[PDB]
Every structure is written in structure tokens, then in C-alpha cells.
Amino acid sequence: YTENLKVIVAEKLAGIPNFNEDIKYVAEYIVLLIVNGGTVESVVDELASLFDSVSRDTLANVVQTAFFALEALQQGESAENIVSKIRMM
């Protein structure tokens, strides 16, 4: 599920107004933090230390969506369906 998660995180990032950072890199960094056992708080904390152009509230939304999407994937939800939901929003 790591390759689809990186895509799903990128899709979420792409929808953030005024998001100026390298999306592919931020998505990779997020998935690195999550796959290796981070808590929601520890992942948000780490991202906030790297990117001062993005609010903690926004980072928290992105992180929440990532963990949520991962669980959904594990339960057998399709990555397409998850992407379609993120893009609607």
C-alpha cells in the first residue's frame, strides 16, 4: 500500500490552496513517517518542523486523511475510489 498512499497524499496536497512545497517530496516524507510507526501528533510535529509555509491545522488534516486512507486501503477499499473522494472535496 505504500505506492498508492504516496499518490493519495499527493492528491490531498494538490487540493490545498497556496500550497507551495514540493508535493512529491512532502508525500514521500509523510509516508515514510507513517509507515514507520509515527503517531498522528508525531507526524504533524515533524512536518511542522520542516515546512513553515503550511499551517499545523492544514498539516493535521493531511495527516488524518493519510492514516485514514491507509486503513481504508487495508480493508480493501480501492485507491481509485479514495482518490475520487479526495478530488471531489
Author numbering: 6 to 94
Sentences reproduced from the published study:
Nuclear abundant poly(A) RNA-binding protein (Nab2) is an essential multidomain hnRNP that is required for the nuclear export of poly(A) mRNA in S. cerevisiae. The Nab2 protein has a modular structure based on four functional domains:23 a unique N-terminal domain of approximately 100 residues, a glutamine-rich linker, an RGG domain, and a Zn-finger domain. Our studies demonstrate that the N-terminal domain of Nab2 is both necessary and sufficient to mediate interaction with Mlp1. The Nab2 N-terminal domain has a fold based on a five-helix bundle that is analogous to the PWI fold found in SRm160 and other nucleic acid binding proteins, although it does not retain the nucleic acid binding function seen in other PWI domains.
We also obtained P43212 symmetry crystals of the Nab2 N-terminal domain that diffracted past 1.8 Å resolution in-house. We used the solution NMR structure of this domain as a model for molecular replacement and, after trying a number of different models containing different fragments of the structure, were able to obtain a unique solution using residues 7–82 (corresponding to helices H1–H4). After solvent flattening, the electron density enabled residues 6–94 to be built to produce a structural model that had an R-factor of 20.7% (Rfree = 26.4%) and excellent geometry after iterative cycles of refinement and rebuilding. The crystal and solution structures of the N-terminal domain of Nab2 were very similar for helices H1–H4 and superimposed with a Cα rmsd of 1.2 Å. However, the position of helix H5 varied significantly between the two structures as a result of a rigid-body rotation of the order of 25°. This difference in the position of helix H5 could have been the result of crystal packing or might have been a consequence of partial proteolysis as it was only possible to trace the chain in the crystal structure as far as residue 94, whereas in the solution structure, this helix extended to residue 99. Inspection of the solution and crystal structures of the Nab2 N-terminal domain showed the presence of a hydrophobic patch centered on Phe72 and Phe73, suggesting that this region of the surface might represent a putative protein:protein interaction interface. Phe73 in particular was completely exposed on the surface of the protein. Overall, the mutagenesis results are consistent with Phe73 forming a crucial component of the interaction interface between Nab2 and Mlp1 and hydrophobic interactions making an important contribution to the interface.
